[PDB]
């Protein structure tokens, strides 16, 4: 058996084909087992519509999830990614930094 804690990165990207649009991303990487719960939050509230959830695995059966959706950040509000995993004794909340 192996278990590996997910690394969690929260960042924003503009797709080059539509640069005015902006996407909030939570990249959850290197985890095992694959069982997981991942949400994007706005002001602590689950964002129910997340357009993209792309899961894959590597040769060593570590899993990778990109969880992302279109958003429009202003100076208002707090955005985050919340992850629950067996390796994590409490849910891990990683806030989005507007400079990322």
- Asked, for residue 27, whether it belongs to a domain, the answer is yes
State this model's resolution in angstroms: 1.2
73, 76, 81, 82: CA torsion to nearest 10: -160
- Asked, for residue 21, whether it belongs to a domain, the answer is yes
- Asked, for residue 14, whether it belongs to a domain, the answer is yes
Residues 97 and 90: their CA atoms lie apart, in Å, by 22
Contact yes or no for 57/31 (Cβ under 8 A): no
Residue 81's domain comprises 7-95
- Asked, for residue 2, whether it belongs to a domain, the answer is no
Residue 37 is part of a domain; what is its CATH number?
2.60.40.10
Q: Is 75 helix (H, G, I), strand (E, B) or coil?
A: coil
Peptide bond into 84 cis (omega under 30): no
**Which of 73, 91, 83, 75 lies closest to 11, judged by CA?**
73
Indicate the number of domains in the chain: 1
- Asked, for residue 55, whether it belongs to a domain, the answer is yes
């Amino acid at each position: 058996m192996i278990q590996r804690t997910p690394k969690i990165q929260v960042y924003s990207r503009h797709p080059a084909e539509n640069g005015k649009s902006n996407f909030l991303n939570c990249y959850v990487s290197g985890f095992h087992p694959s069982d997981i719960e991942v949400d994007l939050l706005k002001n602590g509230e689950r964002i129910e519509k997340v357009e993209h959830s792309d899961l894959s695995f590597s040769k060593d059966w570590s899993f990778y999830l990109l969880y992302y959706t279109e958003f429009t950040p202003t100076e208002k509000g707090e955005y985050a990614c919340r992850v629950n995993h067996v390796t994590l004794s409490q849910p891990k909340i990683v806030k989005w930094d507007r400079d990322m």
